[PDB]
Amino acid sequence: MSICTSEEWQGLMQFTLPVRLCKEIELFHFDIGPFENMWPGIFVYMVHRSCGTSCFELEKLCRFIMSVKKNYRRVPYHNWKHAVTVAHCMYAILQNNHTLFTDLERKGLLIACLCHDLDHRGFSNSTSTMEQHHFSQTVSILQLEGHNIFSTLSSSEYEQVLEIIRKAIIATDLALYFGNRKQLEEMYQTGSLNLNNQSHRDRVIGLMMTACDLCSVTKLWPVTKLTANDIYAEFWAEGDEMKKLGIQPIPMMDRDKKDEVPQGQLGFYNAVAIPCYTTLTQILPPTEPLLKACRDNLSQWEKVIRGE
Numbered sequence: 378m379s380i381c382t383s384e385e386w387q388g389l390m391q392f393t394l395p396v397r398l399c400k401e402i403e404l405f406h407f408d409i410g411p412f413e414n415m416w417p418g419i420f421v422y423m424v425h426r427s428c429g430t431s432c433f434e435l436e437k438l439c440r441f442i443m444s445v446k447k448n449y450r451r452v453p454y455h456n457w458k459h460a461v462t463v464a465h466c467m468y469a470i471l472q473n474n475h476t477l478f479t480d481l482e483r484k485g486l487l488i489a490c491l492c493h494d495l496d497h498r499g500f501s502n503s504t505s506t507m508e509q510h511h512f513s514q515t516v517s518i519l520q521l522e523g524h525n526i527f528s529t530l531s532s533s534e535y536e537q538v539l540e541i542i543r544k545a546i547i548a549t550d551l552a553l554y555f556g557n558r559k560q561l562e563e564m565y566q567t568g569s570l571n572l573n574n575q576s577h578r579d580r581v582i583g584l585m586m587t588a589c590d591l592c593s594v595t596k597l598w599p600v601t602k603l604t605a606n607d608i609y610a611e612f613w614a615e616g617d618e619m620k621k622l623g624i625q626p627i628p629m630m631d632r633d634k635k636d637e638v639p640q641g642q643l644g645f646y647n648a649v650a651i652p653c654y655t656t657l658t659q660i661l662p663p664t665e666p667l668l669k670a671c672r673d674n675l676s677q678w679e680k681v682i683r684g685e
């Protein structure tokens with residue numbers, strides 16, 4: 378577990394978000410992309426507005442942030458950018474559903490989002506091992522000196538957020554998303570979905586985690602495009618690691634077959650992304666704008682495929 382300098386955590390402490398972004402950042406389609414030096418700042422901002430300025434000692438919280446930063450790796454996609462992008466989408470979901478989520482949930486979900494791919498190497502998991510590792514990394518960072526941002530909580534408050542965070546992180550394993558979303562489909566339609574049921578809560582939170590994880594598909598077209606190149610630059614670098622031992626990479630992880638990508642995107646939107654946001658919109662109607670953006674980008678990929 379690496380840790381931040383004093384100057385890193387102190388630098389975050391003096392950050393103020395510039396005002397011109399104050400409305401942007403509440404938008405589901407907000408792109409953090411242009412603002413690299415602000416990304417830790419942005420996360421402080423979001424925590425402050427979702428959970429309140431007096432929810433974590435500023436000090437330990439900046440300590441936590443800058444250190445989580447240093448346990449991400451400088452790979453194309455599963456890096457610090459993605460963790461802040463994921464966090465932000467969760468912030469937007471929290472903001473438009475405020476009355477449904479407990480304080481304990483709101484703090485745990487933002488932190489878990491930030492930590493969701495901790496120490497990702499960029500190579501494919503190809504049971505939920507990666508996610509269980511991510512959660513363990515999160516425990517390590519928490520255990521560190523001056524780093525336990527939950528110190529001001531009770532024994533059962535603590536032993537409960539840790540659990541909200543474990544479940545959240547695990548839920549980011551797309552293999553589990555399918556059965557969970559199916560499960561949620563059934564419940565909702567039978568009318569048997571109970572938010573007062575803790576196990577049902579966990580299911581919905583699962584879907585939220587997926588919806589955040591994948592939120593690159595819900596940005597503006599110019600942004601959605603550039604971000605596809607980032608994910609793909611990792612499949613390909615892994616496929617190269619296949620080639621280097623004469624192995625054939627599956628055709629997604631071969632950068633020779635580069636013009637496969639828009640069809641791959643369309644497939645993925647149809648099989649994975651649209652259902653995800655579809656169901657989420659149904660359980661949480663204020664997240665509609667994610668579904669709309671996803672559809673808009675689906676429609677763009679068709680045009681590339683049809684050569685327009």
Ligand SMILES: Cc1cc2nccc(-c3ccc(Cl)cc3)n2n1
Pocket residue numbers: 551552590591592593594605608641642645
């Ligand atoms: C955000 C984004 C765009 C995209 N395109 C193709 C494939 C995937 C993908 C993502 C996660 C997993 Cl586990 C598997 C595949 N993704 N993810």
Ligand SMILES: [Mg+2]
Pocket residue numbers: 493494507508549550
């Ligand atoms: Mg992950």
Ligand SMILES: [Zn+2]
Pocket residue numbers: 459463493494549590
């Ligand atoms: Zn992720």
